[PDB]
Each structure stands twice: as C-alpha cells, then as structure tokens.
Amino acid sequence: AQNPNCNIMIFHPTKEEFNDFDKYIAYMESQGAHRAGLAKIIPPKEWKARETYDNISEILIATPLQQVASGRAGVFTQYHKKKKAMTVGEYRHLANSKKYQTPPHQNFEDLERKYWKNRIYNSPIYGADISGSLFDENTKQWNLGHLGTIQDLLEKECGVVIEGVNTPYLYFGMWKTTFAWHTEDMDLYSINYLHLGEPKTWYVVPPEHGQRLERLARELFPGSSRGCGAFLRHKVALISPTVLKENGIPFNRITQEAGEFMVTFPYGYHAGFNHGFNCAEAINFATPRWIDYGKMASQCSCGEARVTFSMDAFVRILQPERYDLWKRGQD
Numbered sequence: 001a002q003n004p005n006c007n008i009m010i011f012h013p014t015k016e017e018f019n020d021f022d023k024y025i026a027y028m029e030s031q032g033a034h035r036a037g038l039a040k041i042i043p044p045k046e047w048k049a050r051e052t053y054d055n056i057s058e059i060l061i062a063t064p065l066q067q068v069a070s071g072r073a074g075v076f077t078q079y080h081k082k083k084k085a086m087t088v089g090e091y092r093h094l095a096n097s098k099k100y101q102t103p104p105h106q107n108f109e110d111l112e113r114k115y116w117k118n119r120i121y122n123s124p125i126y127g128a129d130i131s132g133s134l135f136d137e138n139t140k141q142w143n144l145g146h147l148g149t150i151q152d153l154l155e156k157e158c159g160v161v162i163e164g165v166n167t168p169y170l171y172f173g174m175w176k177t178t179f180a181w182h183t184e185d186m187d188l189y190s191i192n193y194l195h196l197g198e199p200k201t202w203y204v205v206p207p208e209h210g211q212r213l214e215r216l217a218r219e220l221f222p223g224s225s226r227g228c229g230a231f232l233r234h235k236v237a238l239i240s241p242t243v244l245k246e247n248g249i250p251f252n253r254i255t256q257e258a259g260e261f262m263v264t265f266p267y268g269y270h271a272g273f274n275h276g277f278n279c280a281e282a283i284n285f286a287t288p289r290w291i292d293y294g295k296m297a298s299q300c301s302c303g304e305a306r307v308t309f310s311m312d313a314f315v316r317i318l319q320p321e322r323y324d325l326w327k328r329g330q331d
C-alpha cells in the first residue's frame with residue numbers, strides 16, 4: 001500500500017503533466033496521496049492563473065463575516081456575525097490596519113504558536129464564500145472555473161441526469177481568519193488555489209481515521225453532539241493540534257503559499273487559518289472513486305447546515321433513504 005503513514009504529499013507536475021486534470025488526480029492517488037486527506041500541487045514554472053492581480057479591488061464582499069469565538073484557546077466554536085458590505089480594496093486596508101494585521105513573527109511555526117495562543121481573543125473578518133473566479137479565461141490548465149462538473153461525473157458513472165451546477169468560490173482572508181473542522185458537502189473533493197497574499201495553514205485527518213476525530217468532537221462539544229448527529233457539518237468547531245496530540249488523533253499539517261494548489265480528498269477532515277491578507281479560490285469536484293463516499297456521507301438534518309441547491313440531487317440519488325429527513329432540515 002502506498003503512503004501507509006498517510007503523510008501529506010507534495011507534487012511538482014511538469015507542464016505536460018498539467019494538461020489533463022483527471023489523469024493527474026488519478027496519478028496522485030496511485031502514489032497514495034489520498035491517504036493523507038490533503039495534497040499540495042506546485043504548478044509548473046511556465047504556468048500562471050492570470051497576468052496580474054492589479055485590478056481586483058472593486059470586487060464586492062457583500063457579507064463579510066466577523067468570526068467570534070467561544071470556549072478555550074484549544075477547543076472553541078466560532079459564529080459568524082454579518083457585517084456591512086465592503087470592496088476588496090476596503091477589506092485589504094482593514095486587514096492591514098493595526099487592529100487586524102499579522103504580528104511580528106520569526107517563522108511560520110512561531111506564527112502558528114501565536115494563532116493557537118491568541119485566536120480566541122480576537123474576532124477577524126472573513127470575506128468567504130463569494131461566487132466567482134480570478135482565473136483568466138485563457139488559462140487552460142487547472143482553471144477552477146473550467147473543471148468537469150460533479151453532475152456530469154454522477155451522470156457518467158451512474159447514468160442518471162440531474163439538475164444543478166458547480167461553480168467556484170472566492171475567499172478573502174486576514175490574520176486569524178479560520179476554517180473550522182469539516183469535510184466537504186457529500187464528502188466531495190475540494191481544490192483550493194491561493195491566488196495572492198499571505199499563507200494559509202492547514203490541518204488534516206486521514207480519511208481512514210475520520211471517525212476518531214468525530215468521536216473526540218462529540219466528547220469536546222457535548223451539547224452540540226446532542227443537538228445533531230453530524231454537527232461538524234455546521235462548520236463551527238475548532239480543536240488545536242496540541243489537543244489532537246493529547247487525545248491521540250492522527251493528523252498532519254502543512255502551510256500553503258501563494259501560487260500553490262491544495263486538494264482535499266473525500267472524507268478528509270480539515271481546518272486551518274490565514275496568516276494575513278490573502279485571496280483563495282476553491283471548488284468541489286468528484287471522480288469515480290468519490291461515488292462510494294458520497295453514498296456513505298453523513299448528513300445534518302437539524303437544520304443548521306443549510307447548503308446549496310445542487311446537493312439536493314446528490315442526496316436524492318445516492319442516499320434515497322435519507323432524503324426525506326434531510327430535505328426537512330433544508331426546509
């Protein structure tokens with residue numbers, strides 16, 4: 001078995017290998033990359049997402065989210081308080097303000113220490129989940145707005161045509177902005193490209209060990225666990241690396257820098273934080289190997305998780321027994 005210790009793998013495809021997205025994902029899996037839950041892909045030196053980022057300041061962040069924490073430094077939840085709209089130029093100036101800017105630090109490890117020590121005492125503002133793309137339409141390789149759609153994959157694999165669409169999302173971050181422990185909707189893959197700015201640190205649990213993280217989460221967030229049998233679908237809980245190590249949960253960590261792709265694999269729990277002002281783009285995708293994960297994915301039916309239009313068909317076709325209850329949670 002390849003990569004039996006489930007380490008995060010880093011790939012350096014040539015420009016020739018960068019032509020065929022599906023083929024390269026299958027190659028990475030042939031080498032055991034999925035076992036980690038997360039892989040990094042450094043694009044060939046010839047490749048670019050677009051020519052420059054000089055003209056992005058007028059993009060609107062209609063609903064910036066202030067991420068307010070509750071709990072203790074290593075075990076907390078966050079809720080999202082909606083703020084007034086602002087442009088990306090306004091948000092970048094806010095991220096660089098004395099109140100919100102990255103503190104002085106020696107290296108990524110020092111910054112990671114400062115994040116876990118101090119996150120809960122601040123409420124950073126995240127421009128998350130903005131429909132759109134920063135890939136130039138002329139970028140033909142690994143353009144996250146031109147991928148094969150999940151609906152077309154399900155149709156190719158299973159023969160059933162379904163409604164729904166699959167488009168990318170932009171994330172404008174600042175120091176301490178945080179993504180809570182989660183897997184993707186329907187345990188899909190994700191791909192994330194860091195277009196510009198400061199790094200993003202990731203934590204991940206191997207898919208084979210995901211239920212160990214879920215059991216710890218039920219112990220650490222016991223009221224949330226009674227409320228919902230899949231409460232990590234709410235995307236609000238954080239657990240630090242120190243707490244994971246104390247409880248023997250297998251995980252790995254890696255920092256993504258601007259110009260790099262990350263891929264999360266089906267049922268790979270992940271969490272992390274931004275180092276400073278940045279912009280990322282991400283989208284879900286599927287492969288034939290996903291189908292079995294989609295059929296087994298947990299679902300939130302308590303009403304909290306509320307997701308896209310397109311998840312309907314995935315539940316309806318892959319999880320018909322669950323459909324009725326899940327849809328009640330959506331309505």
Ligand SMILES: O=C(O)CNC(=O)C(=O)O
Nearest residue numbers: 171179190191192280282
């Ligand atoms: O970058 C973020 O805030 C969160 N991204 C993801 O969870 C992802 O790409 O799957």
Ligand SMILES: [Mg+2]
Nearest residue numbers: 056057058059
């Ligand atoms: Mg603009």
Ligand code: NI
Nearest residue numbers: 183184190270
């Ligand atoms: Ni994700």
Ligand SMILES: [Zn+2]
Nearest residue numbers: 228300302304
């Ligand atoms: Zn729920």
